[PDB]
């Protein structure tokens, strides 16, 4: 019933975030929070959404990531903010 681990919470991304994750090789409909962070990472890296000079800043004002997170840019170091933005794009599910 209860996840391991917060990072092992099972989630079902909402349609647009699911679309985003599947665009970078994610084959699932249910993910752990760790997996969502991993695939978002694949997305940022393949689409080169980071600042070449300041790699901790993601620039996403003209990308689906920006539309879903609701920000033009954000710092990868601000975990609290990033979790808030991800949570709005998913639903928590049970381990069955």
Among 1, 2, 15, 55, binds ligand 62T (CB under 6 A): 55
43, 26, 45: which is closest to 35 by C-alpha? 26
Q: Kindly state whether residue 56 participates in binding ligand 62T, applying the rule CB under 6 A.
A: yes
**Phi, psi (deg, nearest 5) at residue 92:** -75, 140
Q: Kindly state whether residue 76 participates in binding ligand 62T, applying the rule CB under 6 A.
A: yes
CB of 52 to ligand 62T, least distance (A): 9
Specify whether the backbone of 58 is left (phi greater than 0), alpha (psi in -120 to 50) or beta: beta
Non-local (6+) Cβ contacts of 24 within 8 A are 39, 42, 43, 46
CA 40 to chain centre: 4
Site for ligand 62T, residues 15 to 44, rule: CB under 6 A: 34, 37-38, 40-41, 44
CB of 70 to ligand 62T, least distance (A): 13
Residues that bind ligand 62T (CB under 6 A): 7, 34, 37-38, 40-41, 44-45, 50, 55-56, 58, 76, 79, 82-83
């Amino acid at each position: 019933q209860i996840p391991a681990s917060e990072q092992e919470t099972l989630v079902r991304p909402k349609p647009l975030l699911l679309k985003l994750l599947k665009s970078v090789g994610a084959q699932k409909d249910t993910y752990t929070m760790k997996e969502v962070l991993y695939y978002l990472g694949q997305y940022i890296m393949t689409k080169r959404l980071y600042d070449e000079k300041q790699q901790h800043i993601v620039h996403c004002s003209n990308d689906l990531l920006g539309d879903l997170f609701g920000v033009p840019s954000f710092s990868v170091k601000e975990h609290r903010k990033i979790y808030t933005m991800i949570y709005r794009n998913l639903v928590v599910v049970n381990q069955q």
